[PDB]
Amino acid sequence: VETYKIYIFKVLKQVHPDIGISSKAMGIMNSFINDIFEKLAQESSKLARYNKKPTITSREIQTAVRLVLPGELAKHAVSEGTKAVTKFTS
Amino acid sequence: AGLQFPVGRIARFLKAGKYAERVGAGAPVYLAAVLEYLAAEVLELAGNAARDNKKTRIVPRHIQLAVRNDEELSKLLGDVTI
């Protein structure tokens, strides 16, 4: 279990500048992020065992996202992940 | 990357978790972007629920309602207990 709460707060203020969040609600948001992190990281671990090299790359994360997320969320998440890696790579 | 989520911290969490021998530079970037996307989708719905409830802050009931009303978020995140 890790804390993402300041970062969750920053995202909240982008999508709703005028809405705050209680400590208990923030606790639930932070739990969601930890749960999804662990599901993607566990799926990524499995996919890496198939590869020539024992590495988790953005390719393993993308596959893990496509397997773990429901299909419509998966599609949008993959678009966001791909765009971030492209911009970082440049 | 154009993200609010912490790539550096997420890199460290992947390394610490011992999920593989090595982690590529792109992996924590892609992962940070997906987790940020997912936080944004939930906070957007939970914020709308808070407005609908005439509140100025998200409380647990608003997250429970936003997740429950969404067929894919319910499948991903499960039931919210309050």
């Binding site: 705050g20 969040i21 209680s22 400590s23 923030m26 | -």
Partner: peptide, 5 residues
């Protein structure tokens, strides 16, 4: 009760 974050 439930103080703000």
């Amino acid at each position: 009760n439930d103080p703000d974050y």
